[PDB]
Amino acid sequence: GKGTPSFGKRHNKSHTLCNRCGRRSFHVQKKTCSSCGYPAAKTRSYNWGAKAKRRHTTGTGRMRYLKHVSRRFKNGFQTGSA
Amino acid sequence: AAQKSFRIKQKMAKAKKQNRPLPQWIRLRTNNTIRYNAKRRNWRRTKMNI
């Protein structure tokens, strides 16, 4: 009664996509993302979830701005050109 | 589902383009190791979860 026939009553997504974490983790009735924590400004992180920390932390992506910073610092934050 | 978010449909086109085999000119590239796509998807077997 509870298994194979009951599981056929499953068509009501309790989760949507976040704009922040991009995961199917945005709860609707609660309006929270249990991975990002949006729409809170704090990112959701927990020490005991270290695997999870490193699934998302810097390094995991593009680093659009940061990756060039060592170059700039090494140069000494130049101005002008040659 | 016949009345669907545009966000959703955006992702649909994404998956539609992501579901294909390799171009074969890659297999002739110097020092290749890629014989077949490992990330393909078929709606019958496995899902997207959107």
Partner: protein, 60 residues
Amino acid sequence: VFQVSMKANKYQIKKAVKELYEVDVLKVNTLVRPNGTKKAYVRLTADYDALDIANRIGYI
């Protein structure tokens, strides 16, 4: 029939067409294709030939 940017709309499209091609546009229909693009059907007035302008453009 044209492929169009997703940020477009009928007004912009109409405008740009008369601009680029020196045409009187009757009406426009749009859709977003499953391939993530904007297809744009564009009816002309009777004063013009879509065919003639097509091979003017060099697709035919």
